[PDB]
Amino acid sequence: EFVPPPECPVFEPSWEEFTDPLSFIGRIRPLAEKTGICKIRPPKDWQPPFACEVKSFRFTPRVQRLNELEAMRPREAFGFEQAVREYTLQSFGEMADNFKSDYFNMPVHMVPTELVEKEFWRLVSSIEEDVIVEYGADISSKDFGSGFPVKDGRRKILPEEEEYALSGWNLNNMPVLEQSVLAHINKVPWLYVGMCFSSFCWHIEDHWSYSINYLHWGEPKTWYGVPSHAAEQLEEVMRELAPELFESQPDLLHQLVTIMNPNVLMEHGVPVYRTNQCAGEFVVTFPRAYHSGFNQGYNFAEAVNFCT
Numbered sequence: 001e002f003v004p005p006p007e008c009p010v011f012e013p014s015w016e017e018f019t020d021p022l023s024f025i026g027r028i029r030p031l032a033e034k035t036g037i038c039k040i041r042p043p044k045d046w047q048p049p050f051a052c053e054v055k056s057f058r059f060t061p062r063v064q065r066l067n068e069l070e071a072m073r074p075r076e077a078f079g080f081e082q083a084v085r086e087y088t089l090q091s092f093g094e095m096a097d098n099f100k101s102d103y104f105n106m107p108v109h110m111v112p113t114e115l116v117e118k119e120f121w122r123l124v125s126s127i128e129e130d131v132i133v134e135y136g137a138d139i140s141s142k143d144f145g146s147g148f149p150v151k152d153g154r155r156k157i158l159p160e161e162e163e164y165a166l167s168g169w170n171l172n173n174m175p176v177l178e179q180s181v182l183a184h185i186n187k188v189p190w191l192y193v194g195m196c197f198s199s200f201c202w203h204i205e206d207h208w209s210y211s212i213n214y215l216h217w218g219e220p221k222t223w224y225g226v227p228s229h230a231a232e233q234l235e236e237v238m239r240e241l242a243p244e245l246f247e248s249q250p251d252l253l254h255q256l257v258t259i260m261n262p263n264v265l266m267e268h269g270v271p272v273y274r275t276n277q278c279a280g281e282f283v284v285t286f287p288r289a290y291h292s293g294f295n296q297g298y299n300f301a302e303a304v305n306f307c308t
């Protein structure tokens with residue numbers, strides 16, 4: 001069965017250390033850049049409100065067939081497996097919890113994170129069992145607002161919430177403008193509504209950017225990360241073992257389907273670290289750190305690429 005990778009570093013900054021995000025990330029870099037990803041737990045009293053327009057939040061999530069790569073005799077009428085379904089935040093959550101409790105035959109919060117992890121990777125490689133889930137991925141914060149409070153006058157902010165609108169850890173306040181000559185001659189966060197087994201495959205960011213990720217609420221998001229010094233190693237294992245039909249594809253397209261069991265990478269000598277990102281915790285990915293992961297259950301994440 002699946003062997004969990006070693007845990008990535010988790011930091012619990014003091015209030016003093018928590019004042020400036022870029023200063024903090026710069027200070028932890030000697031360790032975190034060697035693990036690709038790290039987790040940051042804010043002080044216990046730092047609790048931003050959830051500021052999305054919940055009443056109107058509607059979306060059509062993308063369908064994810066866990067074993068689509070292993071599955072590569074064409075099945076009758078491929079391309080039409082799943083009927084389309086639009087959800088509200090509430091109705092997606094009802095669907096997500098029902099899916100998970102039915103799947104495991106127990107209440108959603110009683111399913112061990114290790115079991116969802118072992119079962120996810122079993123399902124990804126299984127040809128006997130076709131599990132299909134849905135992911136409310138890549139929803140712009142412009143559509144219904146950020147999960148963080150923002151002083152743009154579109155939504156009421158209470159006095160005790162203003163510090164969160166102004167915080168450097170509010171993802172809308174991270175720096176995003178890359179320096180360049182073109183910048184002198186001539187981005188917002190994205191939202192992710194997850195359910196059990198919804199997932200993201202191995203990738204790095206455009207321009208080898210840092211990214212930062214905040215789980216507003218819900219069940220954990222499980223991460224795997226590879227340090228940048230091993231990026232070429234991972235890419236070589238992909239070349240060797242990924243489907244030949246996709247071998248010649250540019251990285252930007254190949255990354256849409258680069259699913260790989262972390263143990264395969266580990267057996268080929270690639271260092272992999274894991275973490276369960278819980279509600280109220282940040283994950284930071286360092287430049288050219290490959291990462292992938294899946295959601296343990298119904299949850300809500302916000303993410304943005306930032307520059308140093």
Ligand SMILES: O=C(O)c1ccnc(-c2cc(C(=O)NCCc3ccccc3)ccn2)c1
Pocket residue numbers: 135137138192199200201203204205213221291301303
């Ligand atoms: O899902 C997450 O929590 C997550 C975590 C870390 N990074 C990403 C991420 C996604 C994209 C992206 O646009 N993907 C295409 C759309 C997409 C397809 C399946 C799953 C999630 C997105 C680019 C860069 N990073 C997503």
Ligand SMILES: [Mn+2]
Pocket residue numbers: 203204205211291
């Ligand atoms: Mn990413």
